[PDB]
Amino acid sequence: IEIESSDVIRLIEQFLKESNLHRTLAILQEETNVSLNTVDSIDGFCNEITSGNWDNVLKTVQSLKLPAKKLIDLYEHVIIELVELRELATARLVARQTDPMILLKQIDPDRFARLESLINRPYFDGQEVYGDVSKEKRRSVIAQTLSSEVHVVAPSRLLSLLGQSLKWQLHQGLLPP
């Protein structure tokens, strides 16, 4: 006697995705508060954020369900690593035109002001920023915090499992009732 609720829902959601039933996927995720968070590998996801390849991690994040706090943390740190790389244009662009940053601007004005202040400083004061908590530790923390919100599911897992039930029925049989 084995039971599981959320995993089944996730299977169904994957099936819906593969079958181009987008509306039903949306409605299901909305109704059951369970989201399809498929990543090729959690190791690859963590490794991608740790290595600092922000394009990839932000694409993947754009494919995910979003807790506002985790997104504003992530996007904030992305901006920090941007202003460290002296890519000020992109940093400002993210600061003004991305949803988590707008939300941050609304709910926590002092924090966003602090971020823009960091962007507007003549040089990058890495000493304070990464002195409190290092870059490696920040990317690690964000990596864990986001990894908890994702799942890895084989390409067509539901159909595979149904095929397996079919094999079970054929080669073992069904218990009498």
């Binding site: 600092g52 390849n53 922000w54 394009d55 990839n56 932000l58 694409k59 754009q62 992305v78 941007l82 790389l85 890519e87 244009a89 992109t90 662009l93 993210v94 035109q97 991305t98």
Partner: peptide, 15 residues
């Protein structure tokens, strides 16, 4: 635009 490749890709993805 951005001289950096990952930043450029980031720009395309975000915007």
């Amino acid at each position: 635009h951005s001289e950096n490749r990952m930043v450029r890709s980031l720009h395309r993805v975000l915007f």
